[model samples]
Target: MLEMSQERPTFYRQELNKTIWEVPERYQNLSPVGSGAYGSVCAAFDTKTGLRVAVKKLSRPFQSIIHAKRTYRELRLLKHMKHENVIGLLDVFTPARSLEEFNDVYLVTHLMGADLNNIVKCQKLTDDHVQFLIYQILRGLKYIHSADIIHRDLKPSNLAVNEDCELKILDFGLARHTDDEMTGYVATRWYRAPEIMLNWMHYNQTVDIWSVGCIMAELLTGRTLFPGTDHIDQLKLILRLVGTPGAELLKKISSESARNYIQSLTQMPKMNFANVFIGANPLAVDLLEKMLVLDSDKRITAAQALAHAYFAQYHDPDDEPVADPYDQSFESRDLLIDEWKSLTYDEVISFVPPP
Candidate 1:
């Protein structure tokens, strides 16, 4: 395990010219492939390996002091993780200079397929595709949680699919491995679990499960389950969908401050989730309901979710074969990356095709 220490060599500033690999000297730095609150991702090709890769460059002098540390932790955590459903961490690079110029570390990994966010937004996915996506996510989460790592962020954008329909979980910068209690405040606002929104501090892996439920629901409906504009609006959206948390739930909250904040919201009657998704397949709704359970303790585990009827109906558990993203023969892997390199930003908006 890599220790979180300041003395350790930070990789943000090492020039790559000294490296043995042959990245074309003139390989133009194309426009960024993706960007977020923390950093931007650029596209590049390795001349030596003849491989296309996404180079993730961290935002210089991260907005929060904790951001750089978290990114480093994620790098360490990824080093030990190896699973087909999880994104591979190919290599890490630093500028070989001072901390002031350390803002730009590079992460080289295979290009991702369409993110779950775009897939759901642009396509009407079949039940089989949804189940496949959900199953892959569970497999990846189980791997992370089993290693005692918590992926604090598990939204759709963090998930990528290849041309072969294989799914990979990406973006571990917000993840942490600790015995300390969880407060559920780390993930995206909409996909955040209720306990986290209310600031419960002792939460656990179930937080990811809640986000998975939100993702599953979104996949089925072709829209976000909770599309709130602000925290208050988000609370209303949550309550409108799952109803207000019960007194028992409030009692378990870790902070008096959080409890008061939660109580301020108007308690609405529990809505029938099935009715909300009446147009969606019943099995998917069943799985989503199980995942959205308000009590984190009662939320479905990744292992349990794998055995659920929803997956069983659409997928054969006995044939739990894993697809290798490194396998170039896979058409989906090849097409997604190749197509991505050729696409303009406007094309990216219309990238996800219907199942």
Candidate 2:
């Protein structure tokens, strides 16, 4: 897709963490860090820059139209963004020389100490710590939504952090433009907004707000607030905590089955946040209530949440910034596998990792 260099490219292919990784020769000293359904990740030293980086090698990126499209979307968004609270794509490459050989996709980003999941499990967080952590999340979301993008999969595990509480939102594989066609079940079941779970209405930035609420709640209590067994159980758990919405709200549910299911169940009273989260700061409880509302329309926005009294000590409107509206044209297409491969490959070779 681009001009070829006179000097031939060099690649290093090796099996790390029970998975094969074929990356550029510049990335050396591969060491296993993580593995998941998407791919295997390893910590490597970028010989070209002498800095450590996290390399994520996507598993069979072009195996299906779904994975292929997601690869394109993530690469485009991550590369297009730059924020302290958002992880940016440092580099992208593959050992494959030709489009025909392209089956894997490798993404390079800053190496974080660990995700919020691990931190929340072992470390104790003070109110100041939780306040600052939530502030960073909302700060990132404001920038993301400003760019007309939604991090549909916002969760503790998706949030990368350093030992000092520096957090950056990661994993854009499921990110989509605000104008993109709404999809059901976008976020994880436990953190999903009620409107989406019930298929009640078209969603917007507010959906991410619901997830932030869930993450904040989990941080307050060292436990998952809504650990539902299944889809139905998920709704019931949320209702049990937030209480069933008014009859008018119930009528808004689009699916007959979903609506009928709620109607058939007994009405539940909303739990007092202070009582539920024993000994928690009253301001923290207040913010959580505004965020986890069953009605998406009433949910607190990222910007507004940041302005709440809970964040007063750290709230600085001047510090919060927004990104330009993102172009959604690329994500709207239904390109063939070869077309996607060429486009993705071109992006990878377009730039050298920034030193």
Candidate 3:
């Protein structure tokens, strides 16, 4: 079992540095929250404020060049962002000693609620509930995009839901300035936009919109829209749901090679998302249509998504901001953390991707 400590680390005195190795012992490392090929995340307690925070420790440099750059990029972008819907960065630390002693690079942030993947997997969400969650996410994305930041990686697993169903966007590792006309190949294959799959050199934030569409569909159906074993299978699944591209749509793609690859796949008959989701709420269908548009230029911006009729329908007058579920004051936070700590490695292994 991991040892728990009582005192808190002093946030005010410690200056943020790129290579500060030592962390004050006051912050207790409770247990691992999640881990992946990139690194491991842990739950910790803030002694001064009595708050529970998550510390993401990046693993040692990987053999892949892209992975290392992505790790640094995620930390750098997150350090500049501060919003309710966006995870707050409290501090960052790197190893001052040898690389062996520097196996971990810590990223401290306020501990939030369950990830969207867990929620969707475990619960049956109502249309109204899904709309509310999407609104919160779009609100965060709007703020991010407004600041000229593009979240190249947007997926359900990167979203967090606090108490009251408010959503917080996490994992900015692939995020970059939006000055470029097109983003690169950086998103999860399943959540990837059609233009990205076609290697469109001139795509933009619409890539994120495509991801939102996939996530929304998954939330409503309680299943992945395109669960593919490989890149080709993934594209096939997407085409099955969204339909093959028309010539006009195909003409605008950035890469001829990508377009050819897409064309080689056997065309699946198109299904009307609206008709398929006829049993669903009208607002849900409306939002989904806007997100799943084939033309990147016509896709809705995060700000526009916030103003969609779907969210307006379910806007509750009684809704008020509540403290995060992982806040220390909440008895549930301590209990959950305790439960999490007690889980065996095998038990915790199922919660996240393998490292």
- Clashes found in each candidate (C-alpha, N, C closer than 3 A): 11, 0, 2
lDDT of 1 at 50: 63
Estimate the TM-score of every prediction.
Answer: 0.70, 0.86, 0.70
Q: What digit string (tens of lDDT, one per residue) describes model 1 on residues 1-355?
A: 8544333232222234322222224233444555664556667765545667777665542334344344544455555457778887665554434433333455567777588766666767887888888888998887777766667778888899866778888877453433232223323577888776656768678899989998888777777787766556777777777777789888888798877877888887767777899877787778787888877888889878888877775445554443323211222232332232222111212222111
> Candidate 1, overall lDDT?
0.65
Model 3 accuracy (lDDT, Cα)? 0.65
lDDT of each: 0.65, 0.82, 0.65
**Tens digits of per-residue lDDT for model 3 on 146-225?**
65566777888789886678888987764242423233332356787867655666767778888888888888877777
Ranking by lDDT: 2, 3, 1
C-alpha displacement of 98 in model 3, angstroms?
14
Candidates in descending TM-score order: 2, 3, 1
Task: List residue ranges in candidate 3 displaced over 4 A.
Answer: 1-21, 61-71, 94-104, 174-187, 260-270, 313-355
Tens-digit lDDT string for candidate 2 (1-355): 8866734368867877677778778889899977766777899898887778999888778776777777787788888778889998888876766777767778888887889988877878888999999999999999999988877778888898887898999877662424222233333567878787656777788899989998898888877877776667778889898998787777667778777777788998999888999999999999999998888878889989889999888899999988877887987788887788788888776755454
What's the residue-level lDDT of 188 in candidate 2? 57
